[PDB]
A paper describes a structure:
Orthologous proteins to ependymin called ependymin-related proteins (EPDRs) have been found to exist in various tissues from sea urchins to humans, yet their functional role remains to be revealed. All of the EPDR1s fold into a dimer using a monomeric subunit that is mostly made up of two stacking antiparallel β-sheets with a curvature on one side, resulting in the formation of a deep hydrophobic pocket. All six of the cysteine residues in the monomeric subunit participate in the formation of three intramolecular disulfide bonds. The EPDR1 fold is very similar to the folds of bacterial VioE and LolA/LolB, which also use a similar hydrophobic pocket for their respective functions as a hydrophobic substrate-binding enzyme and a lipoprotein carrier, respectively.
Buried surface areas (BSAs) of ∼1900 and ∼200 Å2 (both per subunit from PISA analysis; Krissinel & Henrick, 2007) were created between the subunits. Judging from the sizes of these areas, the smaller interface burying ∼200 Å2 is only a lattice contact, while the dimeric surface burying ∼1900 Å2 is likely to be a crucial interaction mode with physiological relevance. In this mode of inter­action, the second of the two β-sheet layers (β2–β1–β11–β10–β9–β8–β7) mediates the dimeric interface. The structure of human EPDR1 was subjected to a fold-similarity search using the DALI server, and the top two highest scoring structures were found to be the bacterial VioE (r.m.s.d. = 3.7 Å; Z-score = 14.6) and the bacterial LolA (r.m.s.d. = 4.0 Å; Z-score = 12.3). Also, in a recent structure of human EPDR1 that preceded our study, a ligand was observed in this cavity and was also modeled as an extended PEG chain from the crystallization condition. Because the displacement of 1,8-ANS by fatty acids is often used to assess the binding of fatty acids to fatty-acid-binding proteins, a similar approach was made using human EPDR1 and the fatty acids caproic acid (C6), lauric acid (C12) and stearic acid (C18). The displacement assays suggested that smaller fatty acids more preferably interact with human EPDR1.
Numbering used by the authors:
A (entry chain A): 39 to 223
B (entry chain B): 39 to 221
Write the structure that this text describes.
């Protein structure tokens, strides 16, 4: 099996697990592969634990990220140290397995890909994409075999419906220069 | 939305994350909800790192787990602290959400349920099950909102092809009382 080409612009929702917190966080996502930008709007279901809701606009072209309190519109601007890393399967990945989620009438077939050298082979980005359309399902990053971060994607709809979602608000002009906490006060 | 009725007998494969270790492990699974028995055969994926493969047979109606070394069939026999908890949606669970996995023209709709409640929004179990079929997709157990374990399921086939998979090997007749590590 060769790697499919993932769509480069879409919007839906995600659930991100982070080792650093032990927790799952939900958000709306806007992924612009064409423009090497991303926007993440934190979503809440349960009111507890108590946390502040943020909006993130990442603009790898301009080497900057903005983080915006969804309520009060406060804005802190920060550097982009990390290099652009798209949601597609890199051409040299290793095919790991293929499986079916669900059952007859409904099911979906996905493939799992990693970066892993047969001669002492282990996997450090692990991507799950659907077979027919190449939609991203899941992305996991591993250090020394242990999960650091894993994101599930869903409710994917193609394209960016309104690119203004990547336009920071006025409040970012005089933006602060360090990350605002999520902790309830 | 009310809770769908998940099939009580099937076999497939799974991938289980554990917060304790931070790692995922693979296995085949045979789930027999009717007879309260589960069989787990650890699947190897790759060396790196090096760990030994067991098979687990869980016979809840007899209060015991067997752990079997796949390379040697050495058996240890372990009392189950566990009480039986089936892979279904408890009638009284809370509806959390419905969403689509995949994308247009290659999509599957699922529902997320928990034992969380409206007034003091707090969980221990969170299942993901398909809307149409009620197949299991994913289970997470959390404490104080933190992930303890999370299992993803796939290649589900209804029924049990060979119920002798639930029958311990004869070596479990002279079982050890104590457990085997992997290294």
């Amino acid at each position: 099996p060769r790697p499919c080409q993932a769509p480069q612009q879409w919007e839906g929702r995600q659930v991100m697990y982070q080792q650093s917190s032990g927790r799952n966080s939900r958000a709306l996502l806007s992924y612009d592969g064409l423009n090497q930008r991303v926007r993440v709007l934190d979503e809440r279901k349960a009111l507890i634990p108590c946390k502040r809701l943020f909006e993130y606009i990442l603009l790898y072209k301009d080497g900057v990220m903005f983080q915006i309190d969804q309520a009060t519109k406060q804005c802190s601007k920060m550097t982009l140290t990390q290099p652009w890393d798209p949601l597609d399967i890199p051409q040299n990945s290793t095919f790991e397995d293929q499986y079916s989620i669900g059952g007859p009438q409904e099911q979906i077939t996905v493939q799992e890909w990693s970066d892993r050298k047969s001669a002492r082979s282990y996997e450090t980005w692990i991507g799950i994409y659907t077979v027919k359309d190449c939609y991203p399902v899941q992305e996991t990053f591993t250090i020394n075999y242990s999960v650091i971060l894993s994101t599930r994607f869903f409710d994917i709809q193609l394209g960016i419906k309104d690119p203004s979602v990547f336009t920071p608000p006025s409040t970012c002009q005089m933006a602060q220069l360090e990350k605002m906490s999520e902790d309830c006060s």
